[PDB]
Design an enzyme around this catalytic site. Structure first.
Site, mmCIF file in Angstrom:
data_model
loop_
_atom_site.group_PDB
_atom_site.id
_atom_site.type_symbol
_atom_site.label_atom_id
_atom_site.label_comp_id
_atom_site.label_asym_id
_atom_site.label_seq_id
_atom_site.Cartn_x
_atom_site.Cartn_y
_atom_site.Cartn_z
ATOM 1 N N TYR A 112 0.811 -1.116 -0.086
ATOM 2 C CA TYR A 112 -0.110 0.043 -0.034
ATOM 3 C C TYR A 112 0.806 1.349 0.031
ATOM 4 O O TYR A 112 1.857 1.207 0.651
ATOM 5 C CB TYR A 112 -0.980 0.029 1.142
ATOM 6 C CG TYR A 112 -1.935 1.188 1.017
ATOM 7 C CD1 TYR A 112 -3.150 0.900 0.246
ATOM 8 C CD2 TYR A 112 -1.889 2.231 1.613
ATOM 9 C CE1 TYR A 112 -4.002 1.936 -0.162
ATOM 10 C CE2 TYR A 112 -2.657 3.568 1.304
ATOM 11 C CZ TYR A 112 -3.834 3.219 0.327
ATOM 12 O OH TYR A 112 -4.268 4.387 -0.114
ATOM 13 N N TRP A 114 1.131 5.817 -1.338
ATOM 14 C CA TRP A 114 0.812 6.794 -2.590
ATOM 15 C C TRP A 114 1.597 7.073 -3.807
ATOM 16 O O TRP A 114 1.549 7.815 -4.561
ATOM 17 C CB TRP A 114 0.533 8.107 -1.589
ATOM 18 C CG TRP A 114 -0.823 8.539 -1.665
ATOM 19 C CD1 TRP A 114 -1.654 7.830 -0.941
ATOM 20 C CD2 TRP A 114 -1.612 9.607 -2.156
ATOM 21 N NE1 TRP A 114 -2.934 8.324 -1.013
ATOM 22 C CE2 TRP A 114 -2.917 9.363 -1.838
ATOM 23 C CE3 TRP A 114 -1.088 10.589 -3.074
ATOM 24 C CZ2 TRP A 114 -3.889 10.207 -2.402
ATOM 25 C CZ3 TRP A 114 -2.143 11.468 -3.672
ATOM 26 C CH2 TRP A 114 -3.538 11.421 -3.340
#
Ligand SMILES: NC1=NC(=O)C2=N[C@H]3C(S)=C(S)[C@@H](COP(=O)(O)OP(=O)(O)OC[C@H]4O[C@@H](n5cnc6c(=O)[nH]c(N)nc65)[C@H](O)[C@@H]4O)O[C@H]3NC2=N1
Ligand SMILES: NC1=NC(=O)C2=N[C@H]3C(S)=C(S)[C@@H](COP(=O)(O)OP(=O)(O)OC[C@H]4O[C@@H](n5cnc6c(=O)[nH]c(N)nc65)[C@H](O)[C@@H]4O)O[C@H]3NC2=N1
Length: 766
Positions: A112, A114
Site C-alpha cells: 500500500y 501513494w
C-alpha cells in the site's frame, strides 16, 4: 552539463523546472494552475536532501545470518553497501525461495502507498507484475482513506460513492444557499491529487465566498477553511458526529419538519429506523438534549442547524476523518439518512457530497478519453489495515462484508512506494509482529522509517529522473501531461521498472515483464491508445511526437459543468433506480441485518467507541486529531527544507489549547511527551486556541525515530502519531482502520536530551 527548462508534474501539480549545469535549481508552477501548492519547493529538495538513498544496501545481520537473523534489530541502521548485481541476485533468490518453500501465500504484495503519479512508472503495479511471474502473492483490498465508507455505501446508495464525480462547482455557486463542510478542510486537502491535480476546488470555493453563500464548518479545529469563509464554526468532541446527526433528525421528526414525500418515495426502511430514533427500543429518545450530553454542542444549536438545513438549499460536503474511526461505517450512513430527511438529494445545489475535499471533485469533467497504463498482467486478499492481525494470526478467520476468510501464512513482504512504518497504526505492536517475516525488501528514494527497517534496501529514482505520462485531474480529466525527464538518475538510483525487469530476468521471465518494450515504447502505446479512443469520440489529439513537443494536450468541457449528482434518480426513480437491492436508498439494510454483526447494526446507530473524549471511564484526557498534514503529503517531504517551517525544537508540532497547556505548566515552544498505554512520543508544542479544549492536533506522517529498536515501547524522538493509535477494525463489515480514535496525556518533557537521527542517512549509507 545541461542548461534550460523542462516541464513535468507530480501529486502537487504541473511545473517547469529550471536546470543549471545538470542540476534542477527551481520548480515554477504552471501558469495555468489556479492555486499552486507551497510544498512544490520541498519536492525539488527531496531529489537532493541528506536522506536521499544513494546505494543498494543489505542489513548486516541479514547478510550474515539470513533467516536465522536477529530480527529485533531491524531499523538500527547497521547496513552494508553492496553492488547492484549482488543485491539483484539476492532479491531474486529470496523471492524464488519463498515462492518454492511457502507458495504464493508466503509473499505479501499489497504494498500500500501513494507513490508518485505516472502510467508507466507505477511502482506498486510493477511489483505485482513481477510477483505474478514469480508465482503469485497475497494482495490488499480497500485503502486507509475510506476503508469504512467504501464498504457501507454500496449497501446504502448502491455504489462506492466516495470516489465519484460530485455536482459541479458552478451548479453550487448558482443554487446552494447553505454550504456545510462536515469533517472536511478543503483548503488544506485540495493541494494534492492522486493523478496530477488541477486544483479545481479553489476557484469553486472562491466563487461561493463571492456569492455570500452561508458556510458552516463542523470540525474540532478552526481550520483555514473556517478562516477563508469567516464561517459559522461548530466544534463537537471528536467521534460524536453521529450523536449530533441523530439529534438533528429527532428534531425534524418532533417538529414534523422532514420531507415525508422524499422519504416515502425514495428510501426504504425509515419505518424500522424511527422506533430507535424515538427511543422505543432502548428507552433513550435521541433528542438534541441527549446529543448535547455526548457531543458538547448546545441542544438549541443542534435544533437551529436542523431547521436551517431544512429550509434552505443545503449541500452537506463531508470529509473522511470521521469514518477513519471505530464504527466508521455509521458516520456517512447517518449523513445520507439525514440528507434523505431533508429531501434535497438530486436537486441542483442540494443533497450531499463525499469528495469536494479530494482531488478536485466537483471540477467539471471534460469530454476527453481515458488514459491507460501498465498492468500487473489462507485468503489471497486481506483488507489493507489487517496486515498486522494477519502477521500475528496466520490461519485465523476474520469477517468481512458478510464473508469469513482465513489469514494466509506470510513469510515475506516486499514494499515500494509506501511507508507502513509511518502510515500503519500502533507502531509498537507492528514493530514486534514484523519479526514474523523472514525477509523484508523495500524500494524508495528517501530514507524513511520503512527503508530503515528493511533487510534489503534498493534506491529508486524519483519521477524527475525518468519519462512518463499521466492524466491531469482525477475527476475533471483536464488533459494529459508528458512528465519529461529533468535530470539524470542520482548516485546509483534506478527506476522501479529497471529493478523489477532485472529480478524478473533472473527468474527466467524478462521478456514477459518488459513485453519487449522500453520506457518510450510503453509511453507511446498508452498515448496512441487514448488517441484512438479520442478520435472515435470526436476529440482531436496530435500525433505522439507533436504531443511530446508541446508537452500537454487539453480537453474541451461540453456539458460537464451542468452535472447534478442523483438528478436522474430524483427525476424518475422508476426508470433510474439505484443499484441497491430495493432500487431505493436503504436506511435499513436487510442484508446487513442478516450478517449479525454486533458492531454494525442494520441501520445507523450510536455506539460507544473503544475510547473517546469524556467517554464513560475513559483513561486519558485529550483526543489527538491525527489528521492529514498541511505541509506534507502524508510522510512525503518530511526530510526536506520544508520541515524548518513547522518543526518545534526539531520535533513534529503539537497544537494545544491554552487552557490545556496552562493546566500542565506547558509554555509555547516546549518539548512534551505525548503518551498513553500503547506508546510515547516527543513533539514540540504550539499553543493556540485554533484547537478546541480537550483536543490536541498532531498530524499523521512524522518520521518515526525510535531511541532504541530493541527496547520494547521505546520513545519516538520525532513525533509519529501512529505510535499512539490502536490497530482494530472499524467493525466486522469493513475492517477499516481507526487511525483517528486516539486519546492520550501530555506532559512537559524534562527527561535527558535526545538526538534526532531520522533526517540524516545511516552512517554506512553515506
Ligand atoms: N495537504 C495534504 N496532505 C495530505 O497528506 C493529503 N492526503 C490526501 C488524502 S489520501 C486524503 S485520503 C484526504 C484526507 O481527507 P480527510 O477528510 O480524511 O482529512 P483529515 O485531514 O483527516 O480530516 C479533515 C478534517 O476532519 C477534522 N476532524 C477530525 N476528527 C473529527 C471529528 O471527529 N468530527 C468532525 N466533525 N471533524 C473531525 C480534522 O480536524 C480535519 O480538519 O486528503 C488528501 N489531501 C492531502 N493534502
Ligand atoms: N493516524 C492516521 N491518520 C490518518 O488520517 C492516516 N491517513 C492514512 C491514509 S488515508 C493513507 S493513504 C496513508 C498514507 O501512507 P503512504 O504510505 O501512502 O504515505 P506516503 O508518505 O505517501 O509514502 C509513499 C512513499 O512512496 C515513496 N515513493 C514515491 N514515489 C516512488 C517511486 O516511484 N518509487 C518508489 N520505490 N518509492 C516511491 C515516497 O518517497 C514515500 O516514502 O496513511 C494512513 N495513515 C493514517 N494514520
Amino acid at each position: 552539463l545541461a542548461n534550460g527548462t523542462v516541464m513535468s508534474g507530480s501529486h502537487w501539480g504541473v511545473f517547469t523546472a529550471t536546470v543549471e549545469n545538470g542540476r534542477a535549481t527551481a520548480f515554477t508552477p504552471w501558469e495555468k494552475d489556479p492555486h499552486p501548492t507551497p510544498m512544490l519547493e520541498g519536492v525539488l529538495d527531496s531529489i537532493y536532501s541528506p536522506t536521499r538513498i544513494k546505494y543498494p544496501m543489505v542489513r548486516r545481520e541479514f547478510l550474515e545470518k539470513g533467516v536465522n537473523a536477529d530480527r529485533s534489530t531491524r531499523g538500527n541502521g547497521d547496513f552494508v553497501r553492496v553492488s547492484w548485481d549482488q543485491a539483484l541476485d539476492l532479491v531474486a533468490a529470496e523471492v524464488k525461495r519463498v515462492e518454492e518453500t511457502y507458495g504464493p501465500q508466503g509473499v505479501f504484495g499489497g504494498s500500500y502507498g501513494w507513490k508518485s503519479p505516472g502510467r508507466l512508472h507505477n511502482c506498486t503495479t510493477l511489483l505485482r507484475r513481477m510477483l505474478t511471474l514469480a508465482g503469485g502473492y497475497v494482495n490488499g483490498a480497500g485503502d486507509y482513506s475510506t476503508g469504512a465508507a467504501q464498504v457501507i455505501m454500496p449497501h446504502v446508495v448502491g455504489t462506492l460513492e466516495v470516489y465519484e464525480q460530485q455536482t459541479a462547482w458552478p451548479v453550487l455557486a448558482e443554487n446552494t444557499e447553505v454550504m456545510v463542510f462536515w469533517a472536511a478542510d478543503p483548503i488544506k486537502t485540495s493541494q494534492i491529487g492522486w493523478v496530477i491535480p488541477e486544483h479545481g476546488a479553489y476557484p469553486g470555493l472562491e466563487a461561493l465566498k463571492a456569492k455570500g453563500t452561508k458556510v458552516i464548518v463542523i470540525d474540532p479545529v478552526r481550520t483555514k477553511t473556517v478562516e477563508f469563509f469567516g464561517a459559522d464554526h461548530v466544534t463537537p468532541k471528536p467521534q460524536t458526529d453521529v450523536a449530533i446527526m441523530l439529534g438533528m433528525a429527532h428534531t425534524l421528526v418532533a417538529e414534523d419538519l422532514y420531507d415525508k414525500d422524499f422519504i416515502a418515495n425514495y428510501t426504504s426502511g425509515f419505518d424500522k429506523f424511527l422506533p430507535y430514533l424515538m427511543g422505543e427500543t432502548d428507552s433513550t429518545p435521541k433528542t438534541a438534549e441527549w446529543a448535547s450530553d455526548i457531543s458538547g454542542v448546545p441542544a438549541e444549536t443542534i435544533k437551529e442547524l436542523a431547521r436551517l438545513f431544512k429550509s434552505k438549499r443545503t449541500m452537506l460536503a463531508a470529509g473522511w476523518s470521521m469514518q477513519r474511526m471505530h464504527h466508521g461505517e455509521q458516520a456517512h450512513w447517518m449523513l445520507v439518512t439525514l440528507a434523505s430527511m431533508l429531501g434535497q438529494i438530486g436537486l441542483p445545489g442540494g443533497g450531499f457530497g463525499l469528495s469536494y475535499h479530494y482531488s478536485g471533485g466537483g471540477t467539471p469533467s471534460s469530454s476527453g478519453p481515458a488514459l491507460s497504463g501498465i498492468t500487473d498482467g489462507g485468503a489471497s486478499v486481506i483488507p489493507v489495515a489487517r496486515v498486522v492481525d494477519m502477521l500475528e494470526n496466520p490461519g485465523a478467520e476474520f469477517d468481512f462484508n458478510g464473508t469469513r476468510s482465513k489469514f494466509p501464512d506470510v513469510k515475506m513482504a516486499y514494499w515500494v512506494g509506501g511507508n507502513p512504518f509511518v502510515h500503519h497504526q500502533d507502531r509498537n505492536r507492528m514493530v514486534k509482529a514484523w519479526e514474523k517475516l523472514e525477509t523484508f525488501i523495500v524500494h524508495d528514494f528517501q530514507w524513511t522509517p520503512t527503508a530503515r527497517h528493511a533487510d534489503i534496501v534498493l534506491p529508486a529514482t524519483t519521477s524527475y529522473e525518468r519519462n512518463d505520462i499521466e492524466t491531469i485531474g482525477d475527476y475533471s480529466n483536464t488533459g494529459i501531461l508528458a512528465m519529461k525527464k529533468i535530470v539524470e538518475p542520482l548516485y546509483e538510483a534506478r527506476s522501479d521498472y529497471d529493478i523489477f525487469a532485472a529480478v524478473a530476468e533472473r527468474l527466467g521471465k524478462g521478456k514477459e515483464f518488459t513485453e519487449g518494450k522500453d520506457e518510450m515504447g510503453w509511453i507511446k502505446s498508452f498515448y496512441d491508445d487514448a488517441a484512438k479512443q479520442g478520435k472515435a469520440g470526436g476529440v482531436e489529439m496530435p500525433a505522439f511526437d507533436a504531443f511530446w513537443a508541446e508537452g500537454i494536450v487539453e480537453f474541451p468541457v461540453t456539458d460537464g459543468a451542468d452535472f447534478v449528482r442523483y438528478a436522474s434518480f430524483r427525476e424518475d426513480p422508476l426508470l433510474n433506480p439505484l443499484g441497491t437491492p430495493t432500487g431505493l436508498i436503504e436506511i435499513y439494510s436487510k442484508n446487513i441485518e442478516k450478517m449479525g454483526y454486533d458492531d454494525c447494526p442494520a441501520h445507523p446507530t450510536w455506539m460507544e467507541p473503544l475510547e473517546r473524549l469524556d467517554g464513560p471511564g475513559a483513561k486519558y484526557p485529550l483526543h489527538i486529531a491525527a489528521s492529514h498534514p498541511f505541509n506534507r503529503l502524508h510522510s512525503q517531504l518530511n526530510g526536506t527544507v520544508l520541515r524548518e517551517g513547522y518543526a518545534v525544537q526539531g520535533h513534529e508540532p503539537c497544537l494545544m489549547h491554552p487552557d490545556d497547556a496552562a493546566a500542565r505548566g506547558i509554555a509555547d515552544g516546549d518539548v512534551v511527551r505525548v503518551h498513553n498505554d500503547r506508546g510515547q512520543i516527543l513533539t514540540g508544542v504550539k499553543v493556540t486556541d485554533a484547537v478546541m479544549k480537550g483536543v490536541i492536533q498532531i498530524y499523521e506522517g512524522g518520521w518515526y525515530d525510535p531511541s532504541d529498536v530493541t527496547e520494547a515501547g521505546t520513545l519516538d524522538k520525532y513525533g509519529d502519531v501512529n505510535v499512539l493509535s490502536a490497530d482494530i477494525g472499524t467493525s466486522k463489515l469493513a475492517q477499516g482502520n481507526c487511525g483517528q480514535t486516539v486519546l492520550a496525556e501530555v506532559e512537559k518533557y524534562t527527561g535527558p536530551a535526545v538526538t534526532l537521527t531520522g533526517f540524516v542517512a545511516p552512517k554506512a549509507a553515506e
